[PDB]
Paper text:
Ribosome biogenesis is a highly coordinated and complex process that requires numerous assembly factors that ensure prompt and flawless maturation of ribosomal subunits. [name] has been identified as a bacterial cold shock response protein required for the efficient processing of the [name] 5′ end during the assembly of the 30S ribosomal subunit. Here, we report cryo-EM structures of 30S assembly intermediates accumulated in an [name] null [name] strain. Cryo-EM analysis of Δ[name] 30S particles revealing the accumulation of two predominant classes of early and late intermediates allowed us to suggest that [name] participates in two stages of 30S subunit assembly and is more deeply involved in the maturation process than previously thought.
In addition, 3D cryo-EM reconstruction of the structure of mature 30S subunits purified from wild-type [name] cells was performed and the obtained data were used as a reference to evaluate structural defects in the immature particles. 30S ribosomal subunits from wild-type (wt) and ∆[name] [name] strains were purified using a published procedure with minor modifications. In the mature 30S subunit, this structural motif forms a part of the decoding center and bends toward helix 45 and the 3′ terminus of the [name]. Helix 44 is a functionally important segment of the [name] that is directly involved in mRNA decoding and the formation of two intersubunit bridges, B2a and B3.
Residue numbers in the entry:
A (entry chain U): 36 to 53
B (entry chain K): 12 to 128
C (entry chain G): 2 to 151
The structure:
RNA sequence: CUUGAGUCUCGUAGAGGGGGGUAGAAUUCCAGGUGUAGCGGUGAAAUGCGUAGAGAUCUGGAGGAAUACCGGUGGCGAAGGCGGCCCCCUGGACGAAGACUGACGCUCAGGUGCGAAAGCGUGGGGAGCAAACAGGAUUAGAUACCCUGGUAGUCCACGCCGUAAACGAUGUCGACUUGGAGGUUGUGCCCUUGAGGCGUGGCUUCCGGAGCUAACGCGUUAAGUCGACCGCCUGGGGAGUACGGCCGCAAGGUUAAAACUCAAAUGAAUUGACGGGGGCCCGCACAAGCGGUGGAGCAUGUGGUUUAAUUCGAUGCAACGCGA
């Protein structure tokens, strides 16, 4: 994506952090 | 004929088709059979039920050469990856090693921006 | 579903004193006919001894091992999508289906009477035929070959 | 004068820049060998590629583009942005003690300079990818999604453009104001025994009462309590538009109205909530069997036809051996 993957890896840190 | 008795089996497990080629270490592909071309066509009828068809015909296609213990390495993901291993092993062959060596890149090129729906 | 029920407790055979044989007449009951089954299936079972020519109290199973089921289709539409998913047989069906495999072709075979028509098919299993036999021939096909989706 | 601001000694970290090389995988192409009838493609399909040797395989060779893993809620930068490795030049930042100037400061209209991506100009390069354009399916139609090709562009140097949801939608600077848990980088002391414990810095992510907010929320990195400057706002549309100017090769940017029209346009959130959100949990709902109807033939009822009427009502789930 060149701009999503830094967003999902900085969103799903809402998914898979706790 | 030459009866090398061993060989490195190839499973180019693509998604729409999983063609398999049998060979020894020198890269001399002598026999091969295509899952999606084993009479079968389409996509869901070229799925691994066809892969075992290709495996059995290839076993028939090279049973004249007498290859007993078999090395296998795979390319690509896909359903035509697992069932074919069991098929070829049960089809008068003996296994040596299984692997899928599908070439992950180091971020080299661009593959397409395919389906979006 | 979440709750379960235990198997209904059954008294033994009123004639041979064996609960397994008593359960057998209970499945063939259509039109509520055990007294007719007394002249049909009990008259059949009495003839099953001498026609077999051996004690049908524990030799009764010498024709049932091939009949042993292993799998049947369980309709798990898991997540809303029907799958094959054949679950292995649990004891509350693998023996019930054994009796369900008996009289599927023994009603109107065109013979004397099903008082002794059923008394034709039983030794056939230890004489290598009869309805209970070929039941296991088709079960092997649906499983053990569709690993990509089984 | 030394506390504000700055110089020096000293180290610490870093995808901070600029210029050089350099490696390997990966797509592609080309040459070679083996041998072979399909390859690809999707929800099925043809266009396509191929019997010549394609796909597949290993052997090499060319080129271009990006740097798997580490990798991170990590790090750096004024922002834009910056990820292989190594060197050359360089920019900041921070920390330990010191020393030295003595208010040297903060902000800044105009102004100057940097400014993602597209785009333009002149010359190269061009592996993939790919607007445009072709051909094949889809559909009611398809100029779209989808597939097969595919040019500009994407890459490089120089020049221009100046914009973005350029966003933390939070201007810069300073002072004050309870706590907790992490992260990253210095450092002081302590048996560092060590990992660290006791402290101290910086940057940093997440909770949270005060307090603030319409509200969500912010909450020592404030949206708290104050101060100094700057930019902007003044109902929605028209309109970031016309015109004029300035700029730009051009695309166009910036500055920036009015006529006319409406009485709203908005923001936080509440209770309904419909989903082609989701998870869950219930029920002969499904599952596993049984017994069935629908097959026949007979009895009634409903719908129609005829008839003088074949009276009326019900006749989606919830009528049709119903009222009756």
């Amino acid at each position: 994506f060149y701009e999503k993957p830094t967003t999902e890896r900085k969103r799903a840190k809402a998914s898979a952090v706790k | 004929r030459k009866q090398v008795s061993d060989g490195v089996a190839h499973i180019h497990a693509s998604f729409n088709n999983t063609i398999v080629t049998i060979t020894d270490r020198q890269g001399n592909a002598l026999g091969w059979a295509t899952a999606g071309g084993s009479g079968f066509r389409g996509s869901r009828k070229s799925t691994p039920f066809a892969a075992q068809v290709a495996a059995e015909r290839c076993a028939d296609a090279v049973k004249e050469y007498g290859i007993k213990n078999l090395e296998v390495m795979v390319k690509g993901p896909g359903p035509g990856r697992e069932s074919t291993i069991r098929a070829l092993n049960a089809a008068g062959f003996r296994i040596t090693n299984i692997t899928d060596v599908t070439p992950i890149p180091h971020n080299g090129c661009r593959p397409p921006k395919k389906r979006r729906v | 579903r979440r709750r379960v029920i235990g198997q209904r407790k059954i008294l033994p055979d009123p004639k041979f004193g064996s609960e397994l044989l008593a359960k057998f007449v209970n499945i063939l009951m259509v039109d509520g006919k055990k007294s007719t089954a007394e002249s049909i299936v009990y008259s059949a079972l009495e003839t099953l001894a001498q026609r077999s020519g051996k004690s049908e109290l524990e030799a009764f199973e010498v024709a049932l091992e091939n009949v042993r089921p292993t799998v049947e289709v369980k309709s798990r539409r898991v997540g809303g999508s029907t799958y094959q998913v054949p679950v292995e047989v649990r004891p509350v069906r693998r023996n019930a289906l054994a009796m369900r495999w008996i009289v599927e072709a023994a009603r109107k075979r065109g013979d004397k009477s099903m008082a002794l028509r059923l008394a034709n098919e039983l030794s056939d299993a230890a004489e290598n035929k009869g309805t209970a036999v070929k039941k296991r021939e088709d079960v092997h096909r649906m499983a053990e070959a569709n690993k990509a989706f089984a």
